[PDB]
Short mmCIF file of C-alpha atoms and ligand atoms in Angstrom, two decimals:
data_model
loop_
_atom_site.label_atom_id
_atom_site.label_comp_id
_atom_site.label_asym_id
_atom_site.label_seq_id
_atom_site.Cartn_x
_atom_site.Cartn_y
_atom_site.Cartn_z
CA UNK W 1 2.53 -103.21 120.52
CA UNK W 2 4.75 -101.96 123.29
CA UNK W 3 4.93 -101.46 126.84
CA UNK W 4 6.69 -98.52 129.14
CA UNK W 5 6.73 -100.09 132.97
CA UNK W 6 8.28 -98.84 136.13
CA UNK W 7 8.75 -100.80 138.49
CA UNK W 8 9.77 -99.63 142.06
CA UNK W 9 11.00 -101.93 145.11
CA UNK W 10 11.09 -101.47 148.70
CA UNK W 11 13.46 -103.57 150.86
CA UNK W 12 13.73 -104.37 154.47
CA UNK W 13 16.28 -106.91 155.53
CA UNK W 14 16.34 -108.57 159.42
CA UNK W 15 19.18 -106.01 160.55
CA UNK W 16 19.22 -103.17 157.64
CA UNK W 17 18.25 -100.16 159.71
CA UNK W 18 17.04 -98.35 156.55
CA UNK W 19 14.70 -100.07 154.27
CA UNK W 20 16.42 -100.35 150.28
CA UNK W 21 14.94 -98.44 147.71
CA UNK W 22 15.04 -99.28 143.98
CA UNK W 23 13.62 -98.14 140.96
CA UNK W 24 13.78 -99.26 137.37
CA UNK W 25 11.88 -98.39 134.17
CA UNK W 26 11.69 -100.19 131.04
CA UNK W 27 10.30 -99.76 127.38
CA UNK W 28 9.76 -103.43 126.36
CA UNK W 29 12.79 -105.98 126.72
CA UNK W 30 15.49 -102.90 127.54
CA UNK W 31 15.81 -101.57 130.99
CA UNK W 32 16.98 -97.86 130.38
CA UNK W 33 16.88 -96.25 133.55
CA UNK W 34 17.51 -97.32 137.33
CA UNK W 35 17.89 -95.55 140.84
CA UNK W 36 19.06 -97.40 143.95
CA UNK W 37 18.93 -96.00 147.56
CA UNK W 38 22.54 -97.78 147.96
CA UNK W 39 23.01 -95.25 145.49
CA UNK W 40 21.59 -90.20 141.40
CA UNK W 41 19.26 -91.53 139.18
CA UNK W 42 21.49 -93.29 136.03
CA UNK W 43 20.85 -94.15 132.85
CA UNK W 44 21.17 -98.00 131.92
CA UNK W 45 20.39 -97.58 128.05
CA UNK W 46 23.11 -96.43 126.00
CA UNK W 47 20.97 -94.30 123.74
CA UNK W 48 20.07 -92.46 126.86
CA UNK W 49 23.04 -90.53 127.15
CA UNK W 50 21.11 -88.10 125.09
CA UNK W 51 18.89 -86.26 128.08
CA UNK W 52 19.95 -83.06 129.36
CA UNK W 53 20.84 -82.81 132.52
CA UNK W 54 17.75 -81.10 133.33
CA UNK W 55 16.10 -83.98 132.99
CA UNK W 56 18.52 -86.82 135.78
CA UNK W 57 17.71 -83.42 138.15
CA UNK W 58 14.21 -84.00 137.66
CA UNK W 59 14.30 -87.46 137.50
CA UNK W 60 16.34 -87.96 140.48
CA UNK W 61 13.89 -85.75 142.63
CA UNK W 62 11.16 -87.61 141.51
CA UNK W 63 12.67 -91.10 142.63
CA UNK W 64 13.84 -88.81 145.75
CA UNK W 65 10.20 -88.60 146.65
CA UNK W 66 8.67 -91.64 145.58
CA UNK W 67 10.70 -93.45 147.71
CA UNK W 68 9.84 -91.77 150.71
CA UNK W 69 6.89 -92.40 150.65
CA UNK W 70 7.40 -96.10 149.46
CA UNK W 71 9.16 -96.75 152.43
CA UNK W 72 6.40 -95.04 154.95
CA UNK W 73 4.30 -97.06 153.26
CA UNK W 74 5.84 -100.80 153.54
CA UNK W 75 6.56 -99.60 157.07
CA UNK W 76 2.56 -98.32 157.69
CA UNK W 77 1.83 -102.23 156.38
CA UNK W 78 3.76 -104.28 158.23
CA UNK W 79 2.22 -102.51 161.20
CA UNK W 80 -1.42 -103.22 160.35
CA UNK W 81 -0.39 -106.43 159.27
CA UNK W 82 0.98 -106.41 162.70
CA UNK W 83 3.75 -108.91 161.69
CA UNK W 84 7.78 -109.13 163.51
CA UNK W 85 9.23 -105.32 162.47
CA UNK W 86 12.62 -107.01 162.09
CA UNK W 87 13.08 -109.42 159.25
CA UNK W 88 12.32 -110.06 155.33
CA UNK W 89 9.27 -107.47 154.20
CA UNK W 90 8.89 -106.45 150.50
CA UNK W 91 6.99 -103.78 148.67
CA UNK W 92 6.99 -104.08 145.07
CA UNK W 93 4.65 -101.84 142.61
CA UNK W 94 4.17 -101.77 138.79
CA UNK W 95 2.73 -99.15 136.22
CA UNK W 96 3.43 -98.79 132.67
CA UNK W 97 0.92 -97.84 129.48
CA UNK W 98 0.52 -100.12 126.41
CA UNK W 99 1.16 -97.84 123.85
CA UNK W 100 0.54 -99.22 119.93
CA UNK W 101 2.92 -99.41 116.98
CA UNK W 102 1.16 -96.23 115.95
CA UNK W 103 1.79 -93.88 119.23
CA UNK W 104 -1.76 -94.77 120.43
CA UNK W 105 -2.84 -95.50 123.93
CA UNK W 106 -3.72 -99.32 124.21
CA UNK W 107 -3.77 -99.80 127.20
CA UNK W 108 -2.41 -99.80 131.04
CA UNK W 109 -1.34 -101.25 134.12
CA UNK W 110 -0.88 -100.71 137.96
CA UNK W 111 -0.16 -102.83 141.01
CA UNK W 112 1.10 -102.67 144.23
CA UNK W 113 2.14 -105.70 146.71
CA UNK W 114 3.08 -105.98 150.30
CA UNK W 115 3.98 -109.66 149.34
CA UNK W 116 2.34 -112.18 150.82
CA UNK W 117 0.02 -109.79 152.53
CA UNK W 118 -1.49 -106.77 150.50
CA UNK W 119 -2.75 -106.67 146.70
CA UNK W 120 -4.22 -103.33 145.48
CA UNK W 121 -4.40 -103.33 141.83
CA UNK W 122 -5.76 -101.53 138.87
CA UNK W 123 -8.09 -103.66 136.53
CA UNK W 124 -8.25 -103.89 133.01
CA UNK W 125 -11.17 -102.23 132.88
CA UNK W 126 -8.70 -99.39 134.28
CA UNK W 127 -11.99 -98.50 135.97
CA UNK W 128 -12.24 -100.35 138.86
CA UNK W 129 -9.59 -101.85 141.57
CA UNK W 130 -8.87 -105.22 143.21
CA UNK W 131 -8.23 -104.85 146.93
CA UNK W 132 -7.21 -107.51 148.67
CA UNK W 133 -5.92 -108.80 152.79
CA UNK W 134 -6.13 -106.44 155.64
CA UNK W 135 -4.77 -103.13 154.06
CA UNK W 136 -5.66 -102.66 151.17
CA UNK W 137 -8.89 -104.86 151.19
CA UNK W 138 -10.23 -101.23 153.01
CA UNK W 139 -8.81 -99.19 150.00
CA UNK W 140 -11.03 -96.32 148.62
CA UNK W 141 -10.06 -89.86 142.17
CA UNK W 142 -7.43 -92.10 142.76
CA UNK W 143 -8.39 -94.43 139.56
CA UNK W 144 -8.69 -91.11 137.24
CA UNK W 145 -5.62 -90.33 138.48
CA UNK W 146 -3.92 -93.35 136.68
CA UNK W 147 -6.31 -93.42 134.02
CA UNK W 148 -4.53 -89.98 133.54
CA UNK W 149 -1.05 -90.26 134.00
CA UNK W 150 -1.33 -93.68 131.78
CA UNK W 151 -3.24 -92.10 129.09
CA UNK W 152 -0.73 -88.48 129.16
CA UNK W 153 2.10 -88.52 130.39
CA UNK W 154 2.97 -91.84 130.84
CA UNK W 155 2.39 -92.42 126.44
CA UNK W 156 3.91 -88.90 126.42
CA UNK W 157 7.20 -90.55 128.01
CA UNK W 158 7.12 -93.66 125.80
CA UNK W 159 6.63 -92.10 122.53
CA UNK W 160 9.63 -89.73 123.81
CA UNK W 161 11.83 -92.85 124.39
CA UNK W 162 10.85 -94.32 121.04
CA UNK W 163 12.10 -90.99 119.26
CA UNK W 164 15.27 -91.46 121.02
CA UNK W 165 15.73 -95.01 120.59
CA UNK W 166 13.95 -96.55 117.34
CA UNK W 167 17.33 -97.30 116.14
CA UNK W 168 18.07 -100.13 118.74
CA UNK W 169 13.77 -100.71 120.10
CA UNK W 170 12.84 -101.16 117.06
CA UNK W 171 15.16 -103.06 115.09
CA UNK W 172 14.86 -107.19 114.39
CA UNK W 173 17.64 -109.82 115.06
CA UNK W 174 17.38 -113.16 113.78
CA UNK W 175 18.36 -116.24 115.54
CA UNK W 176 22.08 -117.71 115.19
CA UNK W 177 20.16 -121.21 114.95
CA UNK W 178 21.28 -124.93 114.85
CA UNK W 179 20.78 -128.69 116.10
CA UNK W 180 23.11 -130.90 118.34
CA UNK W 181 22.76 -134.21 119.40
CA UNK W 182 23.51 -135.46 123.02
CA UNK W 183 23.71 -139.68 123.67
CA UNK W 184 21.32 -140.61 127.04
CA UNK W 185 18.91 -139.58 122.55
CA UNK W 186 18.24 -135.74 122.78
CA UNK W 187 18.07 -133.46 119.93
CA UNK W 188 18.32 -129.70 121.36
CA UNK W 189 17.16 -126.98 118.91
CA UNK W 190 19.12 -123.92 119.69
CA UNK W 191 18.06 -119.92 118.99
CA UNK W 192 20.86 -117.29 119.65
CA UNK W 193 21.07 -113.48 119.77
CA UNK W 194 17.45 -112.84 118.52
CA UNK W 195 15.59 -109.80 119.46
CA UNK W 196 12.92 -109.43 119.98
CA UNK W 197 12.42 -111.75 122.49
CA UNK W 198 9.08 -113.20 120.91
CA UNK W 199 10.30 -116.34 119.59
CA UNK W 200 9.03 -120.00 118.28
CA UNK W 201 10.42 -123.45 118.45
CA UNK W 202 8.82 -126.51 117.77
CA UNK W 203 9.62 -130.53 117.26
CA UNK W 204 8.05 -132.60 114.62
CA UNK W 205 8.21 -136.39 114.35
CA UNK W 206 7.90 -136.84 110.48
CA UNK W 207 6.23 -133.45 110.31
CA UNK W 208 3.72 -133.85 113.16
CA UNK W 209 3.24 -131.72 115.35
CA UNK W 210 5.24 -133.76 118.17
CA UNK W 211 4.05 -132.89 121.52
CA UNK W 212 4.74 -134.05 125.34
CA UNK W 213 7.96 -135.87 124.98
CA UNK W 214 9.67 -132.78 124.44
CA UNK W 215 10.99 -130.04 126.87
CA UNK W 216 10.27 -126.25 126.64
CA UNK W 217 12.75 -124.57 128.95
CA UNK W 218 12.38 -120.59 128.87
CA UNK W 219 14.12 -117.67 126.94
CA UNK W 220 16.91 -116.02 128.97
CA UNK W 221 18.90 -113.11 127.85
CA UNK W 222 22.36 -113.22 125.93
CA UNK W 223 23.39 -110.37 128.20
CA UNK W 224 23.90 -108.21 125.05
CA UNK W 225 20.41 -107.19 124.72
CA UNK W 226 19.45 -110.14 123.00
CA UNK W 227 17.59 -113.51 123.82
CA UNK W 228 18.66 -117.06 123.64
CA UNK W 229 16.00 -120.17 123.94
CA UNK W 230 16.02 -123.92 123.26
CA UNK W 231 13.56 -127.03 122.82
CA UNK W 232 15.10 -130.56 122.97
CA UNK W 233 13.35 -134.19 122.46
CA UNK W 234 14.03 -137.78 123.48
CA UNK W 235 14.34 -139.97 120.32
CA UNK W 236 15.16 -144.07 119.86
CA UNK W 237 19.23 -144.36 119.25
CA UNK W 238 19.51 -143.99 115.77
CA UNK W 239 15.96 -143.52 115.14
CA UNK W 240 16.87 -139.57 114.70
CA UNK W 241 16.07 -138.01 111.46
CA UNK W 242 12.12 -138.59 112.08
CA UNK W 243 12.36 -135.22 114.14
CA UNK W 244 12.39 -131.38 112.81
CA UNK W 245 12.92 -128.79 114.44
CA UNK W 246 10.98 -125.78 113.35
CA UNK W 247 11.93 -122.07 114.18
CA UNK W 248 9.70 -119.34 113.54
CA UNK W 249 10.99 -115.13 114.07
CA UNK W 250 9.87 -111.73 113.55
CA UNK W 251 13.76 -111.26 111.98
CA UNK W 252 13.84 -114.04 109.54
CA UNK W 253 13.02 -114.32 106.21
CA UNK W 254 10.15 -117.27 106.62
CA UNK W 255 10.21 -120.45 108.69
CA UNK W 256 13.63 -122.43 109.32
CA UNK W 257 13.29 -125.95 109.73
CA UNK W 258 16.72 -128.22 111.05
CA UNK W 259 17.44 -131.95 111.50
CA UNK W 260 20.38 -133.48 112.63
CA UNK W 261 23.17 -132.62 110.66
CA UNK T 1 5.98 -117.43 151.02
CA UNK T 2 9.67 -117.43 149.98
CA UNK T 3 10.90 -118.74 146.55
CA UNK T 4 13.93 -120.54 146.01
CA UNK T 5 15.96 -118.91 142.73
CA UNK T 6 16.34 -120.95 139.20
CA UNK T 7 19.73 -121.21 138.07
CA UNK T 8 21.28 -120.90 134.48
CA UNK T 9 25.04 -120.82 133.43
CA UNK T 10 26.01 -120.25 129.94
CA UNK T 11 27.66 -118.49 128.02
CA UNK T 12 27.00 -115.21 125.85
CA UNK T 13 28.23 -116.85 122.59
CA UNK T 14 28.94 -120.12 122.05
CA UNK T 15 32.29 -121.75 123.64
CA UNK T 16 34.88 -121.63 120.90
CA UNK T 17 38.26 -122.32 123.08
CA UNK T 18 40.60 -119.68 123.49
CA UNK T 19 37.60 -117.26 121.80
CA UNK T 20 37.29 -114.33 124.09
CA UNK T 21 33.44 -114.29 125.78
CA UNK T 22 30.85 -113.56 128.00
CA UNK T 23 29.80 -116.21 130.91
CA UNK T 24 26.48 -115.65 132.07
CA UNK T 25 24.69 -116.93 135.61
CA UNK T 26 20.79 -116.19 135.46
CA UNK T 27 18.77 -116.20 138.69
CA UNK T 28 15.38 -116.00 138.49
CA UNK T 29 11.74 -116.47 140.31
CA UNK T 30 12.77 -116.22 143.88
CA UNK T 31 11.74 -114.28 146.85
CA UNK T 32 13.05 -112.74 148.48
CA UNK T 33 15.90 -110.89 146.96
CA UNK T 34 18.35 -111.04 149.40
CA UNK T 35 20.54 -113.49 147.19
CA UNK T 36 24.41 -114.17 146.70
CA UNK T 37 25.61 -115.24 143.33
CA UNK T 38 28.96 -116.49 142.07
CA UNK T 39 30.99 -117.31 139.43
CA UNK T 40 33.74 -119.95 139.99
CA UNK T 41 36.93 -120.64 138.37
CA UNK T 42 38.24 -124.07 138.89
CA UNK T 43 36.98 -122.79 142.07
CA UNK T 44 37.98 -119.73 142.76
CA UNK T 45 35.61 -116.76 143.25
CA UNK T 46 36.15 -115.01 140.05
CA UNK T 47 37.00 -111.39 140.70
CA UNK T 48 35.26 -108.61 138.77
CA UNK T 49 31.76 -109.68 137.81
CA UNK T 50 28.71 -107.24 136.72
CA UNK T 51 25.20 -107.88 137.20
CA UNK T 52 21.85 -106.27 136.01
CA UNK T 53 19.07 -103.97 137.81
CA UNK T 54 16.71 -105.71 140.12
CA UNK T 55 13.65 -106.35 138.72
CA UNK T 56 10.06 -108.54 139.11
CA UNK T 57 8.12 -110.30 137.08
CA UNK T 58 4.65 -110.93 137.14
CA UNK T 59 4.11 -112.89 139.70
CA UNK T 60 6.30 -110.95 141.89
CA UNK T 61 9.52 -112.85 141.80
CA UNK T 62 12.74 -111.46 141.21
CA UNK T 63 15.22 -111.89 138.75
CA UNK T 64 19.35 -111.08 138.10
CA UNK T 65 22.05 -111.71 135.30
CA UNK T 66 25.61 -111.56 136.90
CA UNK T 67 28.56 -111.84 134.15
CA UNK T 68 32.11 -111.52 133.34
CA UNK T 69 34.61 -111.55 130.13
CA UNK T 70 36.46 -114.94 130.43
CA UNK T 71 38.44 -116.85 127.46
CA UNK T 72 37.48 -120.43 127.82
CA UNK T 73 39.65 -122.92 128.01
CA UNK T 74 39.14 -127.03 127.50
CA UNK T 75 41.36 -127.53 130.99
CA UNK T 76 39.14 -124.93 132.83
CA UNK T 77 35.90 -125.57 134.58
CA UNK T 78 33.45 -123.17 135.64
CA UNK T 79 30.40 -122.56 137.77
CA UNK T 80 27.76 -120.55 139.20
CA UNK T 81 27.15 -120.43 143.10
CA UNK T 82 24.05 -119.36 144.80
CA UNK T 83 22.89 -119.05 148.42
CA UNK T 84 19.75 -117.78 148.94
CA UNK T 85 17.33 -117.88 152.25
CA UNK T 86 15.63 -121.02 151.03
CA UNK T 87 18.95 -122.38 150.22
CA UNK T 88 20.70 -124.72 153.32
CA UNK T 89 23.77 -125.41 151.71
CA UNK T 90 24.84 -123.31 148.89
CA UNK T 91 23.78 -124.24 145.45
CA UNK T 92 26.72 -124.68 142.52
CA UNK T 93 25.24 -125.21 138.71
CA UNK T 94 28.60 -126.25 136.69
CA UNK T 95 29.09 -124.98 133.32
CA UNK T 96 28.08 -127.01 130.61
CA UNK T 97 29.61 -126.39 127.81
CA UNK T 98 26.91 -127.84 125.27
CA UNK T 99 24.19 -125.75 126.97
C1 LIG L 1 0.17 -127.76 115.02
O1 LIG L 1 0.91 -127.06 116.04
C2 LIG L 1 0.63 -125.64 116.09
C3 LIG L 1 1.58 -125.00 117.11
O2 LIG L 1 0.98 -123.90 117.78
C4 LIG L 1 -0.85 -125.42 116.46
O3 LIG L 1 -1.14 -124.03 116.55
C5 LIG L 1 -1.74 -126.08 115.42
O4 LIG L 1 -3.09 -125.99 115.84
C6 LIG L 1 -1.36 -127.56 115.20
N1 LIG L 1 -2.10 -128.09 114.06
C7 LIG L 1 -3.10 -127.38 113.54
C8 LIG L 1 -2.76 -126.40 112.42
O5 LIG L 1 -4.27 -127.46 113.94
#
């Protein structure tokens, strides 16, 4: 399964006298596009250097107008919101389609946020809406809209960027793994350079299923593209080898198991 | 309702001494996203340092990577510094080097 989102942002700063515009799309884990009112509209995935330039004209008018009307829009909220015009205000919205491993439509998604203040969003059901505070909770087409654009050309784009970039979306990278062993002990399991980003590690004291006394801190990129992630225990001086650590990825051959070295 | 940022500093590949890397200071889930990050050698502000595209995640906080090159060294020390709104006194994560 995979999923195509955009996500926009709309900045207003105590001071800035033009709100901040942003705009970045992804396909999965990889960010390949991005536009930025601090400024055209770039390309942040090397495999995008392949577009014509037709295509960062069109793209860059599109962002061109979305943010417009981003902006009149943050700015029409904090009105009815009727909250201090100078200061922090934030509009962030996200849409993407679910597409399958097999170029089918899964799914979709849509929201929209004056943070803190305003939810509008697009259910599951991608039938029906969830409004919510002042604007917004009087929101009113619209929903086949979306159903649209997420069904056509929103798959129509992914299935696009998959053609150009199967190489590098779709390929598998194991984890660099291994064990080391920190005196207060702690045992930290370590997985490096793995892509995807789906990933599993797990403790064991003499092959149970060890949980609690552990810690499970949360994958963060390599900054090549890749993930790292690590799971540590507590375990009686000496007392060590009664612990496991079990590492499970789409990229390896079957399950890895480690103990102290 | 403002979110102060969690801070990471590690490096790309593991610290091998004189190795040629990639040192790596993650911010993630605050709000807003005014934020200043940096990366400290021995304590000075290192110079040229890259960063990724804004972005959110699901619950609406934000989230950065800010980087440079840097050969290690077992005299140097580095850091990452943050100051955020929700942030008095700027924060500073040291390096670890076995994490
Ligand atoms: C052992 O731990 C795994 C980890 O997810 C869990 O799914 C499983 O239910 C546990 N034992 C079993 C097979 O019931």
């Amino acid at each position: 399964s995979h999923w195509l989102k955009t996500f926009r942002i709309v900045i207003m700063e105590p001071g800035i006298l033009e709100p901040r515009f942003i705009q970045v799309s992804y396909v999965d884990s990889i960010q390949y596009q991005g536009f930025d009112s601090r400024s055209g509209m770039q390309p942040r995935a090397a495999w995008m250097k392949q577009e014509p330039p037709e295509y960062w004209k069109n793209e860059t008018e599109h962002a061109m107008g979305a943010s417009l009307l981003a902006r009149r829009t943050l700015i029409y909220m904090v009105t009815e919101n009727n909250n201090k015009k100078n200061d922090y205000h934030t509009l962030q919205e996200v849409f993407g389609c679910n597409v399958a491993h097999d170029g089918s439509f899964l799914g979709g998604h849509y929201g929209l946020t004056y943070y803190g203040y305003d939810y509008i969003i697009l259910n599951e059901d991608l039938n029906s809406w969830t409004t919510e505070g002042k604007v917004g909770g009087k929101f009113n087409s619209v929903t086949e809209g979306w159903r649209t654009y997420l069904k056509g050309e929103c798959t129509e784009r992914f299935l696009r960027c998959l053609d150009l970039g199967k190489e590098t979306l779709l390929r598998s990278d194991a984890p660099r793994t291994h064990v080391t062993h920190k005196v207060t002990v702690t045992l930290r399991c370590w997985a490096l350079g793995f892509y995807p980003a789906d990933i599993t590690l797990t403790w064991k004291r003499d092959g149970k299923n060890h949980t609690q006394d552990m810690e499970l801190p949360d994958t963060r990129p390599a900054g090549d593209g890749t993930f790292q992630k690590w799971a540590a225990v507590v375990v009686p001086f000496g007392e060590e080898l009664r612990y496991t650590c079990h590492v499970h990825h789409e990229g390896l051959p079957g399950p890895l198991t480690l103990k102290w070295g | 309702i403002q979110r102060t940022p969690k801070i990471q500093v590690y490096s790309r590949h593991p610290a091998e001494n004189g190795k040629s890397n990639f040192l790596n200071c993650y911010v993630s889930g605050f709000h807003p996203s005014d934020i200043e990050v940096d990366l400290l050698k021995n304590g000075e502000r290192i110079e040229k340092v890259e960063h990724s595209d804004l972005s959110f995640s699901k619950d609406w906080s934000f989230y950065l990577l800010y980087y440079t090159e840097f050969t290690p060294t077992e005299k140097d020390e580095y850091a990452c510094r943050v100051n955020h709104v929700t942030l008095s006194q700027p924060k500073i994560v040291k390096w670890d080097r076995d994490m």
